[PDB]
Design an enzyme around this catalytic site. Structure first.
Site, short mmCIF file in Angstrom:
data_model
loop_
_atom_site.label_atom_id
_atom_site.label_comp_id
_atom_site.label_asym_id
_atom_site.label_seq_id
_atom_site.Cartn_x
_atom_site.Cartn_y
_atom_site.Cartn_z
N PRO A 1 8.02 2.40 9.61
CA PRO A 1 7.83 2.34 11.06
C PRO A 1 8.75 3.32 11.78
CG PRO A 1 8.14 0.14 10.12
CD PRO A 1 8.58 1.14 9.09
N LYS B 1 10.16 -5.64 8.44
CA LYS B 1 10.36 -4.56 7.48
C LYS B 1 11.84 -4.27 7.32
CE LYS B 1 5.78 -2.84 8.03
NZ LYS B 1 4.85 -1.74 7.65
N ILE C 1 2.59 1.28 9.29
CA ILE C 1 1.50 1.02 8.36
C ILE C 1 1.22 -0.48 8.42
CG2 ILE C 1 0.74 1.15 5.95
CD1 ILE C 1 2.77 3.43 5.55
N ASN D 1 2.50 3.91 23.14
CA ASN D 1 1.31 4.06 22.30
C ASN D 1 1.58 3.50 20.91
OD1 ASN D 1 -0.60 5.42 24.06
ND2 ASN D 1 0.69 7.25 23.92
#
Ligand SMILES: *[C@@H](c1ccccc1F)c1ccc2cccnc2c1O
Ligand SMILES: *[C@@H](c1ccccc1F)c1ccc2cccnc2c1O
Ligand SMILES: *[C@H](c1ccccc1F)c1ccc2cccnc2c1O
Lengths: 118, 115, 117
Positions: free
Chosen positions: C1, C32, C64, C97
């Site tokens: 990330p 994560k 992901i 975003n």
């Protein structure tokens, strides 16, 4: 809608009202009220385009909808015209990446624009 | 194709020839003519990778096609190799986002590449 | 990330500890390990939000997986809260975003995260 311009043009060559002009023009072009529009210009960048460091720009436009073949061509004419007129960048040294964003994937004000489901 | 590198390595550490080498290697790897290729290097950035501010890079490659499983692994080897050799950034502190762009979504010269 | 913040807030106003707090809070929110998390903060930017040059931020988060309706609203609350508290940016002058990346489209360490085929 969100428009980002990265260019090797110097900061001093960016007109003082350029951000407002982009905002107004993008509002008109997208049919969205100006309050939604974000603009970001990044001058003085270390860039090459076709192996040359003559003035160029790499841009992105994010929008929720209002993205597509005919529309994007219209955006390109509008935005290349502004970059050429205001920053003196030739239109054939500009790239603009268009992104059609899903409302669920745009965050704002502590949430997203996906408000319909939990 | 279009390649962007953001890194916390200082601008002075960016060697003469770097943009041109990226351009040439990308033309080779993507098969696209050098005239198409745009490269953008952004040094001196405020970044952390795994909570550490040792040299790192966050990159993107946009391309109309030529994006895919084996191709992307090949790009990563190429680009990590260059960043390690030229900017002394360890490959395990580099991320590269790959984007397959539809030609109608890339604007150029007052139009798009769908036209 | 990876999380990128671009803002017109000046570098002097970015508090000591900011990148580390982003790193740890994002590890927690994404579940994560911190080792994976990349953060990038870009102050002093020439930008406008709604035509105004008051403090604002344009951000992106790539991951992901772990991207989606409820998850993204949660990321937004977390990150707007941090930008408001640390950079004094109003949440309604922040855009983020979100990108759900395919493992085959994320490169790292000479390869990608698609190792299967
Ligand atoms: C445009 C926009 C701005 C920032 C990031 C991504 C975007 F797509 C935009 C903002 C807000 C909005 C609200 C409702 C419907 N459409 C919208 C946009 O297209
Ligand atoms: C997050 C990430 C980092 C940089 C660019 C794009 C991303 F999605 C990320 C990094 C590594 C990783 C390894 C295994 C599984 N997931 C991962 C991520 O989501
Ligand atoms: C390179 C390029 C630049 C920006 C965004 C995406 C890209 F792929 C590129 C330019 C023109 C072009 C025309 C036809 C086929 N591929 C192309 C590119 O990859």
């Amino acid at each position: 809608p969100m428009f980002i311009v990265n260019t090797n043009v110097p900061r001093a060559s960016v007109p003082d009202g350029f951000l407002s002009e982009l905002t107004q023009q993008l509002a008109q072009a997208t049919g969205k009220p100006p309050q939604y529009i974000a603009v970001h210009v990044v001058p003085d960048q270390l860039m090459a385009f076709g192996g040359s460091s003559e003035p160029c720009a790499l841009c992105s436009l994010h929008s929720i909808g209002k993205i597509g073949g005919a529309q994007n061509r219209s955006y390109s004419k509008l935005l290349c015209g502004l970059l050429a007129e205001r920053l003196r960048i030739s239109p054939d040294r500009v790239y603009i990446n268009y992104y059609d964003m899903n409302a669920a994937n745009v965050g704002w004000n502590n949430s997203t624009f996906a408000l319909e489901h939990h």
